[PDB]
UniProtKB/TrEMBL annotation:
It is found in: Chromosome; Cytoplasm; Nucleus. The lineage of its organism: Eukaryota, Metazoa, Chordata, Craniata, Vertebrata. DNA-dependent RNA polymerase catalyzes the transcription of DNA into RNA using the four ribonucleoside triphosphates as substrates. Belongs to the RNA polymerase beta' chain family. It comes from the Eukaryota. It comes from Sus scrofa. This is DNA-directed RNA polymerase subunit.
Amino acid sequence: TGYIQRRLIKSMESVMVKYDATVRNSINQVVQLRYGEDGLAGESVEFQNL
DNA sequence: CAAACACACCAAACACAAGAGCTAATTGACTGGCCGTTATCGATGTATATATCTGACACGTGCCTGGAGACTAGGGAGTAATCCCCTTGGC
């Protein structure tokens, strides 16, 4: 499992959310126009019903 | 017939194998040639110890010269009487 976790971490170690509110990597290539397709931190999110 | 690319196959390598944390003990190069120091073997003595021969001193034996002993031969030195020459003595 450790080798898997290492390989995963090294492949996305530089992706981040720039102040333009978009997700890019070191090469400034846009990966997502908004973080998680919504632009919200995963901390303050709760399950709900429609 | 020769050249283009594609596919299947064979043959050759690359890199990875979680995070680490503690403790112990096995390995401590080696023949050989050669130079450089030094220990040893060897000669060439001069100093000291010992042996042979020569020289001076000592004790001892000796050959030689002169001296000494017993005994002898026979005569030199020497009593006892005598004469009377000559000396001392005298007026």
